[PDB]
Structure formats: C-alpha cells, structure tokens
C-alpha cells in the first residue's frame, strides 16, 4: 500500500516566519528559507514510511511505522519521540513539542497543517513527476 508515495514541491505556505521563530529556528535560516519551495519525497510501504525534506542545501531524512514509537528530526535538528497515526488512507496525524501536525493527501496535492497554540502553519505542495 503506497497512497502517499511520490515527490511533491511546495506551492505556497502561511505563517512560516511566526512558526519557525516560535520553535527556535535560527533567524538566518528563517530568512533564507521563507521563499524556498522545498521538495518532499515520500516512500510509503504499508505502515512503513520514509520521507526526505529538501530545502536548499539542507536535507532532512525521517522514517516511521504507523502506530509505533518513532524518532523524528524536526527543523531545528531536535529529534523527538512520538507516534504517527493514519486516519484513513490519506491522512497522517502526530503531535510533538505541543505541535499538532496533520498531513493530508488529496490526489496530487498535499496539505500540511502544523498548529502550535494560536499559530497555524499551513503548507500546500503539488506532485512533481515520479
């Protein structure tokens, strides 16, 4: 099962700066990263996920098995222990550091919503070939 598999590129995002400041991303990376159209590569094999996020020079690789403890490297470099769940074939949900993350695939469009208190950081990405 491979619902999420593919390569997607950011089209637009809301509240990037406010969110990244809140979480402790260095200001130099915030300013150089706010206009980056990052690429996310996902390989789904049943419950087993691997994803690679590229933004400029910076590459972050992560993996998890749905419903199990995993260790996710966040944008700051902090690795967090959490559990990622599926809510249907096309929705991944997790919470770490009081952030709720929801990743939802609709055809070729992935919407990622990260909520930290009143800050709702929304990213919309579009499939880019294979």
Residues lying near ligand PLM in the complex (CB under 6 A): 29, 32-33, 36, 38, 40, 42, 51, 53, 55-58, 60, 62, 72, 74-75, 84, 92, 94, 101, 103, 110, 112, 114, 123, 125
Spell out where 32-127 has E strands.
39-45, 48-55, 58-65, 69-73, 79-83, 85-86, 91-96, 99-106, 109-116, 119-127
With beta carbons less than 8 A apart as the criterion, state whether 49 and 64 touch. Answer: yes
Complex with ligand PLM: residue 17 or 118, whichever CB lies closer: 17
Nearest residue to ligand PLM, using CB? 33
CB of 109 to ligand PLM, least distance (A): 11
CB of 117 to ligand PLM, least distance (A): 17
Q: Strand 79-83 to strand 69-73: parallel, antiparallel, or no bridges (unpaired)? A: antiparallel
| H/E stretch holding 33 | helix 27-33
CB of 50 to ligand PLM, least distance (A): 9
């Amino acid at each position: 099962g491979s619902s999420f598999s593919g390569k997607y590129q950011l089209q637009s995002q809301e509240n990037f700066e406010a969110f990244m400041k809140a979480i402790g991303l260095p200001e130099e990376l915030i300013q150089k990263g706010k206009d980056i159209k990052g690429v996310s590569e996902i390989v789904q094999n049943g419950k087993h996920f691997k994803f690679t996020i590229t933004a400029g020079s910076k590459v972050i690789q992560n993996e998890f098995t749905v419903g199990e403890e995993c260790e996710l490297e966040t944008m700051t470099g902090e690795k967090v222990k959490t559990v990622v769940q599926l809510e249907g074939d096309n929705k991944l949900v997790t919470t770490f550091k009081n952030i709720k993350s929801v990743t939802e695939l609709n055809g070729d469009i992935i919407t990622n919503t990260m909520t930290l208190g009143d800050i709702v950081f929304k990213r919309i990405s579009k499939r880019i070939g294979t």
